[PDB]
Amino acid sequence: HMAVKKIAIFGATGQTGLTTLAQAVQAGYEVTVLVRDSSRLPSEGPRPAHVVVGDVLQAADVDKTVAGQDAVIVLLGTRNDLSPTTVMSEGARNIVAAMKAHGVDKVVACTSAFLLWDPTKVPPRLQAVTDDHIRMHKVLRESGLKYVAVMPPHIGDQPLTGAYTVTLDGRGPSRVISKHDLGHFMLRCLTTDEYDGHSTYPSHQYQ
Amino acid sequence: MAVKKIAIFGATGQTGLTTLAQAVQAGYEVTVLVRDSSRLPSEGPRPAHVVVGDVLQAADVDKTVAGQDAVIVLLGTRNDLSPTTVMSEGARNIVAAMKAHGVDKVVACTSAFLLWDPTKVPPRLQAVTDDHIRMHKVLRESGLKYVAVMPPHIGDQPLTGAYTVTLDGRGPSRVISKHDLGHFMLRCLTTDEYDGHSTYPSHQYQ
Ligand SMILES: NC(=O)c1ccc[n+]([C@@H]2O[C@H](COP(=O)([O-])OP(=O)(O)OC[C@H]3O[C@@H](n4cnc5c(N)ncnc54)[C@H](OP(=O)(O)O)[C@@H]3O)[C@@H](O)[C@H]2O)c1
Ligand SMILES: NC(=O)c1ccc[n+]([C@@H]2O[C@H](COP(=O)([O-])OP(=O)(O)OC[C@H]3O[C@@H](n4cnc5c(N)ncnc54)[C@H](OP(=O)(O)O)[C@@H]3O)[C@@H](O)[C@H]2O)c1
Ligand SMILES: O=C(O)c1cc(/N=N/c2ccc(S(=O)(=O)Nc3ccccn3)cc2)ccc1O
Ligand SMILES: O=C(O)c1cc(/N=N/c2ccc(S(=O)(=O)Nc3ccccn3)cc2)ccc1O
């Protein structure tokens, strides 16, 4: 028996999402993904249990993805596009509404460690994306759901270790986390309540 | 010039609720225009007068503005993604009512997007921003004493009364708590120094 077994992953086709999905399938989760029509999961990769094709900006599609889950992981982003956007915050608004309507409480959602910085220290090139992370975090904090705010520093390509530091409610001692370790942490947050209502900063020294 | 009686439009919104609470605690005699009274809190500070109606209805606006010393505007649209004229049409009704009743002072919130390049606006916020621009022009062209408040991201941090106000430009911080923003709206009732200017309240919260 698995207490948390059915999960929705938003952003499963992305850099962190692909390894989070692979790790979740290996760990025995029954994974539902929401994918945009033109960007499905790769053919040879791990297969989720359920695929909804649609858009996080459509409440109906988010409702179809959240229905019947035990928990939600959010790895939405805009790839290498740094333009002004609201896809993460509006997506989170739809996810919150769906979770409430469907009785799902646990949401583990990735924004960024810039939400623990002096705002004057965010690089201007990243300020438009960070502004939407700030909007998204406010939506999730005000929802009343069991929300783990994951606020990573630079996401790298180093290995899965499971040995990273998790700093609560502040910046940690390294400035990198591998995408594989970030995905491992998102899944770890499904199985404990200790991070609920906190900000978390995962980081590691790869050596 | 002393302001005692104010109307607040948008009193049931996130900034409106704390502006209303702060105004009642400070002694203002507050009139609000609300579409649904159940959205006002049952406990604690309550306004002195409640008009049930719509800012799009000139007669409801007229009933709200009658007898006031000043008007605070904290209108906004919920989730409008595409062209909308609620705020600017509301502002037209507010202006007409202020002129008809001899009310000379209006402090109105739009957004700091009006202080930055238009390409900084997220596409899905373009329509609300376009109507903020229309509302701002309505208020500037009215000849009324108008303080334009153009806040950045509105946060949930506790009131500080310690924020910065930048005049006709942007300040060095990118968030204002809804509570500090409401405190600033009220401060604008106690002075003429911001009239005819754009104002950018911002602060660093821890
Ligand atoms: N160093 C870093 O790169 C760094 C550091 C800290 C924080 N962050 C933030 O961490 C988060 C995760 O980053 P990442 O690099 O893993 O993500 P990513 O590679 O940018 O992937 C973004 C995911 O979101 C999906 N998506 C975007 N718009 C969508 C929409 N309208 N509807 C449904 N799905 C949508 C994308 O799907 P498609 O396949 O359809 O595009 C993709 O699966 C991002 O928010 C990022 O800003 C990144
Ligand atoms: N969210 C941000 O960070 C941010 C940042 C900068 C600027 N702004 C802008 O700041 C202003 C205040 O924002 P806010 O978040 O505090 O507002 P909000 O929570 O969205 O509240 C909007 C207020 O306007 C009222 N309203 C809407 N349509 C009305 C109508 N036809 N007649 C009468 N009242 C009506 C609403 O009444 P109901 O309760 O009846 O709906 C509510 O009281 C907005 O114009 C917003 O666009 C927001
Ligand atoms: O595309 C990107 O490169 C991108 C990057 C993003 N964030 N990158 C970050 C965010 C935070 C950091 S950080 O490592 O410098 N934070 C720190 C710094 C010092 C001490 C502790 N923590 C480093 C990189 C956020 C969105 C993005 O799109
Ligand atoms: O820096 C910011 O985050 C910033 C944010 C601002 N946000 N303004 C708004 C205005 C309206 C809303 S809304 O929730 O009611 N409607 C919406 C929300 C998203 C997309 C389309 N419509 C949401 C945000 C406005 C100016 C800013 O500088």
Entry keywords:
homodimer; 207 residues; alpha/beta; 5 helices; globular; binds NADP nicotinamide-adenine-dinucleotide phosphate; binds the ligand O=C(O)c1cc(/N=N/c2ccc(S(=O)(=O)Nc3ccccn3)cc2)ccc1O; oxidoreductase; platelets; Biliverdin reductaseB; inhibitors
What does it look like?
- Chain A: One of its GO terms (molecular function) is FMN reductase (NADPH) activity.
- Chain A: Its EC number is 1.5.1.30, 1.3.1.-, 2.6.99.-.
- Chain A: This is Flavin reductase (NADPH).
- Chain A: InterPro entries: NAD(P)-bd_dom, NAD(P)-bd_dom_sf, Polyketide_Oxido-like.
- Chain A: The active site is at residues 110, 189.
- The structure is a homodimer.
- Chain A has one domain (1-207).
- The first copy, chain A, has 207 residues and is of the alpha/beta class.
- In chain A, the strands form two sheets. In chain A, strands 3-2-1-4-5-6-10-8 form an eight-stranded mixed sheet, with helices on both faces. Chain A has a two-stranded parallel sheet with strand order 7-9.
- Chain A contains five helices and ten strands; from the N terminus they run E-H-E-E-H-E-H-E-H-E-E-E-E-H-E.
- The termini of chain A are far apart.
- Helix content of chain A is 30%, strand content 21%.
- In chain A, helix 2 (59-66) packs across helix 3 (87-102) and helix 3 (87-102) runs parallel beside helix 4.
- One ligand SAS sits between chains B (76, 78-81, 111-113, 124-125, 128, 152-153, 174) and A (86, 90, 131, 135).
